[PDB]
Design an enzyme around this catalytic site. Structure first.
Site, PDB file in Angstrom:
ATOM      1  N   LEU A   1       0.832  -1.191   0.000  1.00  0.00           N
ATOM      2  CA  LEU A   1       0.000   0.000   0.000  1.00  0.00           C
ATOM      3  C   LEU A   1       0.872   1.248   0.000  1.00  0.00           C
ATOM      4  CD1 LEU A   1      -3.112  -0.726   2.222  1.00  0.00           C
ATOM      5  CD2 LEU A   1      -2.366  -1.747   0.080  1.00  0.00           C
ATOM      6  N   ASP A   2       0.211   2.397  -0.049  1.00  0.00           N
ATOM      7  CA  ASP A   2       0.879   3.686  -0.050  1.00  0.00           C
ATOM      8  C   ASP A   2       0.538   4.462   1.214  1.00  0.00           C
ATOM      9  OD1 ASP A   2       0.182   4.221  -3.623  1.00  0.00           O
ATOM     10  OD2 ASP A   2       1.277   2.653  -2.543  1.00  0.00           O
TER      11      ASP A   2
END
Ligand code: CDL
Ligand code: 3PE
Ligand code: 3PE
Lengths: 125, 156, 606, 48, 459, 11, 88, 168, 176
Positions: G42-43
């Protein structure tokens, strides 16, 4: 846009002196951190210190009170603008109020001597 | 317990005294800077940023949660007005000059228009209400022994 | 002539009784809130009788219960003046307070010091009834300051809500700034007429008598909400909603106007006051309506609306319709209280989210409070027959029918529009858009202690205005001869407000991105007036109290001058007179000088 | 108790009674309730 | 009057010889009996003042002070019963003896007619106070404080005495009401002016103006509860009573010999009320408040109007009681903590739920909340000053406002915040201190009810 | 049903 | 009008509900310890928006100091539990 | 309650004209009140008054003999000065109470006249202005140390001024 | 609010905080959640544009322009979270949030009832003194003479024994 002030200081982010990446300045920050952590740890070794039957003493508070109360006259050195502000605050306003009151009383006195000022109902004074 | 060495003193004119004063107040030298010397009594109590206490990080569980101040963290000489129940330097999105300008302009406009309307008022295109008995010259005290101007009111 | 005083003292005795119980030990066994609620109900049922006897006789009454002192031709005594104003205000206040007490009994469960809260409320109530039915300006000052301190406590009931303390301090400061002019009036009257009573003051209906009027004027501006000294009304909202309604919808603010109207006889012969009552009260119908367009907090919005209505009433006073002003107080109270009641219900149902920005679909999810809120909103707008009309529209008649200043009239009508504006704002943002509130839901309003009060208050807000407008003696002579575009102005302009609010609230959609425009930012931030006042005035005053007075006078100069000077002087003289060394060769020379001196003195003086 | 049942503290009651009686007397006899001169200006004597 | 004094002169040997386990209770209860018997003076049926001999007398302006003193004695006792608990029985007995000597002197002086007797007693008041302050303080500057106290007082004392002599010689006697029935008027020259000075300067130096308010804070701070009580309550009142009783002769001088003193009093009221905002030390705040109110007293004393005198007496009594009460509360919060500072202990009212209502009921009486003798006096004095000039309501109002401010500041930095977490030494309220608070309060209620007693000469 | 911490209140 | 308190099962079910209604990367099958940056790639943007959605879901606010460090649903739940003092 | 002192003007009561087809509530309300409340109260009052009458007691009114005045009072001597000054204080107090009586009667008249206070409530105002000119010319600028001597000086200065005016 | 922060910060956290602040102010500006989502996605794109860049120059420039744009286009009256500062519940209950040590001064006539709970306080305090001194050496042994420390606190490296400085955290009253 925005300008500083004595009340509304320049907030944290916008401050140009922040976002700096100086190693010396970051080291100063980390030194402040070391200091503050030593303080908080010395404080927590007493907040929870069992067998305690008393409270904590705040020496910063005591020194602040000393400097506001009794360290004043010794370190006090008279100079002008200081003597000046003092003489002002001690003389000026008293004398202004006094001229006011004296003028008013003389007005009232001459008025009455003439016999004019409506004093009806001024039975209690 | 306290002692002179732990209490304040005179204006340190030598780094020798300055550094000891700083390590006493529990600060760092390069940040320590006392007040000017005009002989008002400041002595050697640090000069700190003229910031309020609504600014401080409110999340950290300070020990003095009502002052957001830690244990030995030096105390701003003017805290009594920054106790957070008082003056707030919480910065504003709008700015000082512009807010004062807005307010003064508005208030001046208002008072000016109020004077304008007092000088050139409104009123209904009629005359003054009438009153039968000499404007009731009796019921307004008057007297039972004086016949003033006979105020007669006519029909149209 | 005995039942009357009996009732007028019985109401106070009833309100006392609980407080007395507070002293005792029964509370831990007894339901103090219900006890007090029912005592209040019976106090209201009592107060009703005066209304019947008064409308059937129109006989005012004046009483002197107890003689306090005799201070050498200026006596004092507990004197009551049961006339229209107070004999009606008692009934209205009780009709509201009974409902408020039920609402509190329901709204403040899970709190331990609820009996304490109730005692505080009924204490304020006693003080306000005193202020209302009092005649001696001293008794009136008693009511004044007791109300002030009760409001302080109630705003602070949660003595950890830091900003609440500051709000209370604001309130006290402004109320004292009013007390200044009030004491001015007391003094001027005790001098120029020897008495404090309205009876013996009415005889000042001929002289300039302008300073006491300025004093009462500042008292109004302080205890009520006006231009210079409004900022304390919005902050009180930090406190609970029941008190934010009682003490800030129909009481503690109407007090100043009540005082002015009781003093009206001397205000008809001063054409300056008649004016300044317009450049001070009508203005507030703008400097708060503005702030009543973007503010998100329900209670803040309602408080700004209250300030608007109070300015309107001060305006009608200025132009001499005091009985109109009083009737409007009476009516206004009903719905301005029901609004806070509904808002409190909403909040407690939710997780303490005043903000409109996080609520919606309130109609479907909660029909009752929404119906009542719409009732109140339209009544405040000025719907033709909801007890708002029967005062507001006569007032809007007179305002254009008399010789009223232009700008004053104009901003007043603008405010009459902004009423509908922010009312429909409430409506849209709370009752017509989508449910922007959190997912969880634990709604409950089927409780009687919260469903019955609103019902009673709605019946009141719908009937009492009409009842009174048709039953009171016709104090003044109206004006019923004007064009339609001046008889229906309030109606037309409120409909305009409705249309405009609809257009704009619907424009809020359409992905029309917003922009921080200065007019709206000003409105939201009150006009920056607090933001500058409360940030410079304290700072400068305190910095002066420190620099000049404490240090530069009381620790520096008044010590360096007298005591330390004497010290240095005597110290130096002693250093001199004991710098002596033990040498006879010197002591004898000194003896010789002295002998010479004595001989010469005798020679000269013969 | 003692205090509250003290009598006529500094005569603020006897005086009210006396004023009632005197006002009756004078209202009847036609005299004024208060003369602007206290002592008899006859027994008094002044310079020129 | 001996019926009031002799027993107060018997409490001493009583204290000396009584056993430790019982001296406290015995002396306390018997001092309360004395307070009770001290009410015979209130049988002032008619206007004929009371005179018992050529050596004593009473009056409506003095009786209140007498009762207040005889009733503040036992409160000093009680408030002085937890500290010096580890000090020897002999020492605490000395303390009691000094308190009782203060009581006796104050009674004899507030009763005496001859101003010379008044003066010797007014100056004998010192020794017990100086002692109490030096030998039982808790700091070091108590020494300088006592020195200032003593020498201010004696500097005042001297020219007062010299003028009393000039009088006793020019006039035949010094007895009061004879000074009245044989007063006269003065040619109004520099001689009589300096006489006016030498007569009022001491009473003023005692009842502090702006210029000489310096010895009050040091005293009330360095000194213990009893010294603070008695200062704030009576040892100021002595100057006021002397000035009232003596100004009867100096007519007309006091019309133009007042402007400077009235000006100073008002300006000082204002500046000190302001300092009360930013004065950390609680007892110092209280002391400066006392200054602010005694300035009103003085401004009302000078101009010589009846309303003014009655307001002066009202406010006098009220402030006496209220200051004793506030000082009890301060001491209370100190014995648990041992730091006068206001900002250290905060956010109470969660552990002392009741005490607050003994804090509150004081402030409200300081900021002139009615119905209270406090506001009655403030208001009558403001009336007199408005008559004397229309441009003094300004200062009256500024003071009222700043008071309404700092009273609540004090309430809110000690009973409105959130509780600290290192004050484990918060021994709950003692029945004793609760009793002291209740006893300082209740009389305020009864006098608010029936004040005709507490009016003054003119009523 | 939980506890509720409080001060003494007996005195 | 107070509803009942919160328990661990309710908290967990809710958090899974929300992180599943999420659409960017979650393959609709989240392990209680389904690490965002490590175990799901994820970011930081996504993580912060998750924290914000949780703030909105539970009314209160999560400070940055801990928002930046939360990297596990179990950690989020432990945080909420130590903040609301649940599970007597 | 000396009615010659306190007038208590007459009471021109109106008459009832209840022209409708509905009953007056006050009728039944006040009937029930006067029934249930006044009955026991009145019986108790009679009981108390009977006990009073059986153990009756009387008390008189103190009549202070008169004495010489300040005028016929040699300076230096005191006894006379005291027996005059106290009489004068009595007179001062009585005049103050007279003022109180006037003010009370005035407020009564005002209220009892209602809105017509400007016409029918003007008689008493004249008594007031007159009495007040008297109390002014007597006790205006004395001082809290007021007394017969200062009042006499006031009177004498005023007499001298009036006499100088008359002679020119 | 339990863990403490570091002295300095990093570009990472600065940008994150700017992001969260701007998104909250946007939720406040644009009420409807649809519009909020829309403009939030727009801001996300704005960020992801310059994301991959790493030059401290562009970093500082964009950050200091972003803060100015934010402060100049922020909401005057933002959306405060009740339970957090600025709201209408912050500290609302601190007037009821009493600590425990008020217990000791109870009267026995009162702790007579509530007996069980007071049957467990002792075995809790007993769980404190028996393991206090150890909690000190754990630091006085690991009080690295380097003298450069943070405010963090190490756990009980042993088993069975408890951690250091758990009193000022445990026993912290509820929120209610
Ligand atoms: C004159 C006209 C002016 C009216 C304006 C009054 C302002 C009101 C000020 C105020 O609220 O005072 C606080 C006070 C109550 O304070 P509180 O903190 O709510 O008391 C709670 C106790 O801590 C705990 O409750 P409690 O168990 O102690 O209750 C029993 C009671 C027991 O009191 C007694 O029995 C003492 C009897 C003497 O004790 C008290 O409540 C306090 C005394 O108000 C009162 O109820 C006292 C009577 C009010 C009438 C006026 C009293 C003078 C002021
Ligand atoms: C017609 C009359 C015209 C008068 C026009 C001026 C009237 C406005 C001046 C009133 C002063 C108000 C002082 C005040 O209330 O300050 C409140 C301040 C907090 O205010 P707030 O904005 O809510 O900030 C909360 C953030 N924590 O925090 C405080 O608690 C303030 C602390 C008080 C400091 C002492 C102030 C001394 C009195 C100032 C007198 C000056 C005004 C004179 C008015 C005439
Ligand atoms: C010198 C005082 C200062 C010293 C303080 C220390 C005091 C200790 C000494 C003993 C206590 C002081 C004595 C106070 C006496 C109380 C007087 C009193 O009870 O009030 C009397 C009042 C009757 O009212 P009254 O003013 O007398 O006449 C007007 C017509 N109603 O009747 C009442 O209604 C009283 C109400 C009681 C409840």
């Amino acid at each position: 846009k925005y300008k500083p002030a004595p009340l509304a200081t320049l907030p944290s982010t916008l401050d140009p002196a922040e976002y700096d990446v100086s190693p010396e300045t970051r080291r100063a920050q980390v030194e402040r951190l070391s200091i503050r952590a030593r303080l908080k740890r010395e404080y927590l070794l007493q907040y929870n210190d069992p067998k305690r039957v008393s409270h904590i003493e705040d020496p910063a508070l005591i020194r602040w009170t000393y400097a506001r109360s009794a360290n004043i006259y010794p370190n006090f050195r008279p100079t002008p603008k200081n003597s000046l502000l003092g003489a002002v605050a001690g003389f000026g306003p008293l004398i202004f109020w006094y001229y006011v009151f004296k003028t008013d009383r003389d007005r009232k006195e001459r008025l009455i001597q003439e016999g004019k000022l409506d004093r009806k109902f001024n039975i209690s004074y | 317990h306290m002692t002179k060495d732990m209490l304040p003193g005179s204006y340190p004119r030598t780094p020798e005294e300055r550094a000891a004063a700083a390590k006493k107040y529990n600060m760092r030298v390069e940040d320590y800077e006392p007040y000017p010397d005009d002989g008002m009594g400041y002595g050697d109590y640090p000069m700190l940023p003229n910031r309020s206490q609504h600014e401080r990080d409110p999340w950290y569980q300070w020990d003095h949660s009502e002052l957001r101040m830690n244990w030995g963290e030096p105390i701003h000489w003017d805290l009594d007005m920054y106790i957070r129940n008082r003056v707030d330097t919480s910065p504003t999105p709008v700015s000082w000059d512009v807010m004062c300008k807005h307010l003064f302009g508005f208030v001046a406009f208002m008072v000016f228009m109020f004077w304008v309307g007092h000088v050139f008022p409104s009123y209904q295109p009629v005359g003054p209400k009438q009153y039968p008995y000499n404007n009731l010259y009796l019921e307004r005290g008057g007297d039972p022994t004086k016949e003033p101007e006979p105020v007669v009111h006519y029909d149209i | 002539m005995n039942i009357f005083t009996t009732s007028i003292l019985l109401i106070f005795i009833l309100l006392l009784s609980p407080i007395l119980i507070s002293m005792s030990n029964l509370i831990k066994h007894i339901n103090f809130p219900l006890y007090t609620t029912t005592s209040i109900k019976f106090s209201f049922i009592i107060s009703l009788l005066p209304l019947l006897m008064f409308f059937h006789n129109n006989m005012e009454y004046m009483i002197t219960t107890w003689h306090w002192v005799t201070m050498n031709s200026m006596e004092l005594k507990m004197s009551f003046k049961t006339d229209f104003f107070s004999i009606l205000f008692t009934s209205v206040a009780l009709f509201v307070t009974w409902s408020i007490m039920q609402f509190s009994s329901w709204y403040m469960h899970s709190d331990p010091n609820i009996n304490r809260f109730i005692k505080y409320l009924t204490l304020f109530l006693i003080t306000m009834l005193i202020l209302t039915s009092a005649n001696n300006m001293f008794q009136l000052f008693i009511g004044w300051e007791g109300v002030g301190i009760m409001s302080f406590l109630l705003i602070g009931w949660w003595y950890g809500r830091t900003d609440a303390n500051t709000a209370a301090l604001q309130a006290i400061l402004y109320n004292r700034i009013g007390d200044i002019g009030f004491i001015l009036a007391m003094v001027w009257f005790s001098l120029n007429m020897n008495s404090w009573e309205l009876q013996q003051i009415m005889f000042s209906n001929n002289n300039d008598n302008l300073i006491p009027l300025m004093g009462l004027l500042i008292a109004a501006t302080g205890k009520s909400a006006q231009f210079g000294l409004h900022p304390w009304l919005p902050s009180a909202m930090e406190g609970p909603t029941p008190v934010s309604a009682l003490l800030h919808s129909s009481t503690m603010v109407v007090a100043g106007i009540f005082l002015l109207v009781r003093f009206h006889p001397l205000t008809t012969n001063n054409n300056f006051i008649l004016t300044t009552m317009l450049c001070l009260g009508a203005l507030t119908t703008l400097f708060t309506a503005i702030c009543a367009l973007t503010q998100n907090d329900i209670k803040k919005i309602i408080a700004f609306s209250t300030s608007s209505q109070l300015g309107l009433m001060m305006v009608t006073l200025g132009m001499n319709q005091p009985h109109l002003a009083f009737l409007h107080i009476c009516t206004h109270a009903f719905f301005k209280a029901m609004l806070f009641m509904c808002s409190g219900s909403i909040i407690h149902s939710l997780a303490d989210e005043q903000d409109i920005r996080k609520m919606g679909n309130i109609t479907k999810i909660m029909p009752f409070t929404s119906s009542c809120l719409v009732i109140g909103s339209l009544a405040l707008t000025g719907m033709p027959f909801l007890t708002g009309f029967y005062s507001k529209d006569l007032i809007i008649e007179a305002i254009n029918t008399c010789n009223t200043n232009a700008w004053a009239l104009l901003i007043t009508l603008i405010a009459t529009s902004m009423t509908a504006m922010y009312s429909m704002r409430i409506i849209y943002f709370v009752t017509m858009t989508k449910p922007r509130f959190p997912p969880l839901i634990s709604i409950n309003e089927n409780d009687p202690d919260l469903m019955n009060p609103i019902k009673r208050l709605a019946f009141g807000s719908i009937f009492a205005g009409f009842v009174i407008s048709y039953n009171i003696p016709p104090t003044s002579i109206p004006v019923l001869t004007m064009p339609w575009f001046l008889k229906t102005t309030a109606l037309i302009i409120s409909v305009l407000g409705f249309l405009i609010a609809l257009e704009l609230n619907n424009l809020t959609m359409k992905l029309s991105m917003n922009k921080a425009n200065p007019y709206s930012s000003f409105s939201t931030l009150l006009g920056f007036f607090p933001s500058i006042i409360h940030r410079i005035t304290p700072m400068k005053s305190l910095n002066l109290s420190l620099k000049t007075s404490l240090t530069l006078l009381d620790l520096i100069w008044l010590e360096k001058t007298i005591p330390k000077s004497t010290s240095t002087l005597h110290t130096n003289m002693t250093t001199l007179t004991t710098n002596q060394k033990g040498l006879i060769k010197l002591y004898f020379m000194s003896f010789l000088i002295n002998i010479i001196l004595i001989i010469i003195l005798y020679s000269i003086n013969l | 108790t003692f205090v509250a049942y003290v009598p006529d503290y500094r005569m603020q009651e006897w005086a009210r009674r006396e004023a009632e009686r005197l006002v009756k007397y004078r209202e009847v006899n036609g005299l004024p309730i208060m003369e602007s001169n206290y002592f008899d200006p006859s027994k008094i004597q002044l310079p020129e | 009057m001996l019926k009031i004094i002799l027993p107060s002169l018997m409490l001493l040997p009583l204290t000396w010889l009584s056993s430790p386990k019982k001296t406290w209770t015995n002396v306390t209860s018997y001092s309360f009996l004395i307070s009770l018997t001290s009410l015979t003076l209130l049988w002032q049926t008619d206007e004929n003042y009371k005179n018992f001999s050529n050596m004593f007398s009473s009056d409506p302006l003095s009786t209140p002070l007498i009762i207040l003193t005889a009733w503040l004695l036992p409160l000093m006792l009680m408030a002085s019963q937890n500290h010096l608990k580890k000090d020897n029985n002999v020492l605490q007995k000395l303390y009691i003896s000094m308190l009782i000597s203060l009581q006796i002197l104050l009674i004899m002086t507030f009763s005496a007619t001859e101003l010379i007797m008044f003066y010797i007693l007014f100056e004998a008041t010192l020794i017990p106070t100086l002692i109490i302050i030096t030998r039982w303080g808790n700091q070091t500057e108590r020494l300088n404080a006592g020195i200032y106290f003593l020498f201010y007082t004696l500097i005042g004392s001297i020219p007062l005495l010299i003028a009393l002599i000039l009088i006793q010689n020019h006039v035949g006697t010094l007895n009061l009401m004879i000074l009245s029935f044989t007063t006269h008027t003065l040619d109004a020259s520099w001689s009589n002016n300096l006489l006016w000075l030498a007569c009022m300067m001491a009473f003023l130096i005692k009842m502090p103006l702006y210029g000489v308010h310096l010895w009050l804070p040091k005293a009330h701070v360095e000194a213990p509860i009893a010294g603070s009580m008695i200062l704030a309550a009576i040892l100021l009142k002595l100057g006021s009573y002397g000035m009232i009783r003596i100004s009867i002769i100096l007519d007309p001088l006091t019309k133009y010999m007042a402007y400077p003193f009235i000006l100073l009093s008002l300006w000082g009221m204002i500046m000190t009320s302001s300092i009360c905002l930013r004065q950390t030390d609680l007892k110092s705040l209280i002391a400066y408040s006392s200054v602010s109110h005694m300035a009103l007293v003085i401004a009302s004393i000078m101009i010589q109007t009846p309303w003014s005198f009655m307001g002066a007496t009202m406010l006098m009594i009220a402030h006496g009681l209220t200051s004793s009460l506030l000082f009890c509360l301060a001491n209370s919060n100190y014995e648990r903590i041992h730091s006068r500072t206001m900002i250290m202990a905060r956010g109470l009212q969660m552990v002392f739920p009741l005490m607050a209502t003994w804090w509150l009921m004081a402030s409200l009486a300081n900021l002139a909340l009615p119905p209270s003798i406090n506001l009655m006096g403030e208001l009558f004095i403001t009336m007199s000053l408005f008559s004397w000039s229309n441009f003094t309501i300004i200062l009256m109002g500024i003071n009222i406002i700043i008071t309404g401010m700092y009273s609540m500041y004090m309430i809110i930095t000690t009973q409105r915040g959130k509780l600290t977490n290192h004050m484990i030494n918060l021994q709950p309220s003692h029945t004793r201190e609760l009793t002291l608070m209740a006893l300082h309060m209740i009389p305020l209620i009864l006098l608010t009810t029936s004040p005709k007693l507490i009016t003054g000469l003119t009523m | 049903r939980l506890f509720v911490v409080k001060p003494s209140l007996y005195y | 009008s107070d509803a009942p308190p919160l328990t661990l099962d309710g908290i967990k079910d809710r958090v899974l509900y929300v992180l599943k209604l999420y659409d960017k990367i979650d393959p609709e099958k989240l392990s209680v310890n389904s690490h965002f940056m490590k175990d799901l790639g994820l970011d930081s943007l996504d993580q912060v928006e998750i924290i914000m959605a949780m703030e909105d879901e539970f009314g209160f606010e999560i400070p940055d100091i801990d928002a930046e460090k939360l990297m596990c649903p179990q950690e989020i739940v432990d945080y909420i539990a130590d903040k609301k003092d649940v599970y007597e | 309650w000396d009615k010659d002192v306190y007038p208590e003007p007459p009471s021109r009561t109106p008459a009832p004209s209840p022209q409708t087809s509905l009953p007056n509530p006050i009728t039944y309300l006040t009937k029930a009140y006067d029934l249930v409340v006044d009955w026991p109260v009145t019986l108790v009052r009679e009981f108390i008054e009977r006990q009073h009458a059986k153990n009756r007691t009387y008390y008189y009114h103190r009549q202070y003999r008169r004495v010489p005045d300040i005028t016929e009072c040699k300076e230096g001597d005191v006894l006379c000065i005291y027996e005059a000054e106290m009489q004068w204080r009595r007179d001062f107090k009585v005049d103050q109470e007279i003022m109180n009586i006037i003010q009370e009667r005035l407020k009564a008249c005002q209220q009892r006249e209602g809105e017509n206070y400007q016409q029918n409530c003007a008689k008493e105002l004249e008594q007031f202005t007159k009495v007040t000119k008297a109390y002014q010319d007597r006790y205006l600028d004395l001082g809290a140390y007021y007394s017969a001597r200062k009042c006499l000086a006031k009177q004498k200065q005023r007499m001298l001024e009036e006499r100088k005016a008359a002679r020119q | 609010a339990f863990c403490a922060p570091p002295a300095y910060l990093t570009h990472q956290q600065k940008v994150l905080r700017l992001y969260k602040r701007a998104l909250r102010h946007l939720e406040s500006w644009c009420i409807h959640r649809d519009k909020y989502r829309y403009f939030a996605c727009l801001m996300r794109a704005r960020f992801e544009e310059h994301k991959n860049e790493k030059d401290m120059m562009r970093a500082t420039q964009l950050l200091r322009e972003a803060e100015e744009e934010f402060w100049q286009n922020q909401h005057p009256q933002p959306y405060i979270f009740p339970d957090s500062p600025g709201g209408t519940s912050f500290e609302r209950y601190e007037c009821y949030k009493v600590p425990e040590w008020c217990l000791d001064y109870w009267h026995p006539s009162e702790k007579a009832m509530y007996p069980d709970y007071f049957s467990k306080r002792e075995q809790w305090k007993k769980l404190r003194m028996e393991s206090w001194d150890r909690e000190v050496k754990q630091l006085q042994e690991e009080t690295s003479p380097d003298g450069i420390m943070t405010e963090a606190l190490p756990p009980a490296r042993r088993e069975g024994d408890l951690p250091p400085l758990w009193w000022h955290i445990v026993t912290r009253p509820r929120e209610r």
